[PDB]
Design a binder for these strands. Structure first.
Ligand SMILES: [Ca+2]
Ligand SMILES: [Ca+2]
Ligand SMILES: [Ca+2]
Length: 300
DNA sequence: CTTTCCACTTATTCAACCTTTTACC
DNA sequence: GGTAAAAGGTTGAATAAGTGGAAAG
């Protein structure tokens, strides 16, 4: 229902590569003729502060329902079957490029099973369980028990290229960070101001992440580990690269959500640095206050 | 019988954050 | 030497992904 301008379709695909998810529920249901009912869909869950992105996607595609996900988050879910055609037409024309493309392909296979009403019979349920085994986190314990002949095997790697800077604006709206690092320094003011751009992602998309270096013509990859988990970040710390390469990209290709406000505050700091005001008392004061009112410091 | 919606749950991949060290001139 | 750039990380929660129940014809 939003009357805000519609979201650009590539920005939407990039935001979905970041934050979207495909869903296939295969549920025990003793009122169904086959003993199972299904539900197929696409969904995005965000913090409450970004509910307006969900409204804007809802009004762009003209489909989906919005509901709370606990007290601090909100979802857009599309599962009405005819409305899934809008989702398929979109991602066929503006395709995903992360490993999530493999989940879209499994969703589309499932759509074809359900469109033929095959899932109302046991052959169709078996084909959906085969599809679901490869989808996201795979089969539940109960489905593994009911369908032991379905082996869980690893998926082929997706290797696609960034299509344009609109996709990148949508993806950065999901995964990006515009950070102002205030480094204790042996300098006259005692504080070094360093702007840091990052995009963060699991190691499954290392090839895509490395390609950001050539696509943007700057930056580097940092590797991370915590517990059983590994991920990467594309990082830019060189001020001329931030000012001449990163900032113009998102000035031209507008971010969505609260993160736009953080980007615009970050650009105020970059203008001060370009003017060397970050090495003055008044400039440092302004930058300290900007830090306190962006990202985690922003009130909601 | 099946679809659709709305309330609700949960593991970790994200974002955002820090300090210290080295590069550069 | 002093400023910029990179290195070397930590961690809490907004994401992704999933689950429970039932209204409706
Ligand atoms: Ca993501
Ligand atoms: Ca995000
Ligand atoms: Ca501001």
């Amino acid at each position: 229902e939003s009357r805000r301008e519609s979201i650009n379709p590539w920005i939407l695909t990039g935001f979905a590569d970041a934050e979207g998810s495909f869903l296939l529920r295969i549920r025990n249901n003793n009122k169904s003729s086959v003993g199972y009912s299904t539900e197929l869909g696409f969904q995005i869950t965000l913090h409450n502060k970004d509910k307006s992105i969900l409204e804007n996607i809802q009004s762009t595609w003209k489909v989906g329902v919005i509901a709370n996900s606990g007290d601090n988050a909100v979802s857009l879910k599309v599962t009405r079957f005819e409305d899934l055609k809008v989702i398929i037409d979109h991602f066929e024309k503006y395709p995903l490029i992360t490993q999530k493309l493999g989940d879209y392909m499994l969703f589309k296979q499932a759509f074809c099973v359900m469109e033929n009403k095959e899932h109302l019979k046991i052959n169709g349920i078996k084909e959906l369980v085969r599809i679901k085994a490869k989808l996201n986190w795979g089969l539940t314990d109960e489905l593994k028990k009911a369908f032991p002949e379905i082996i869980s095997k690893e998926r082929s790697l997706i290797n696609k290229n960034i299509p344009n800077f609109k996709w990148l604006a949508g993806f950065t709206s999901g995964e990006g960070c515009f950070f102002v690092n205030l480094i204790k320094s042996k300098s006259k003011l005692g504080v070094q101001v360093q702007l840091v751009f990052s995009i963060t992602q699991h190691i499954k998309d290392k090839n895509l992440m490395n390609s950001l270096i050539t696509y943007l013509g700057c930056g580097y990859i940092k590797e991370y580990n915590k517990s059983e988990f590994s991920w990467l970040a594309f990082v830019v710390t060189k001020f001329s690269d931030i000012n001449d390469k990163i900032i113009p990209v998102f000035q031209e290709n507008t971010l969505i959500g609260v993160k736009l406000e953080d980007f615009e505050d970050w650009c105020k700091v970059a203008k001060l640095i370009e003017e060397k005001k970050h090495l003055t008392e008044s400039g440092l004061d302004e930058i300290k206050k900007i830090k306190l009112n962006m990202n985690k410091g922003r009130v909601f």
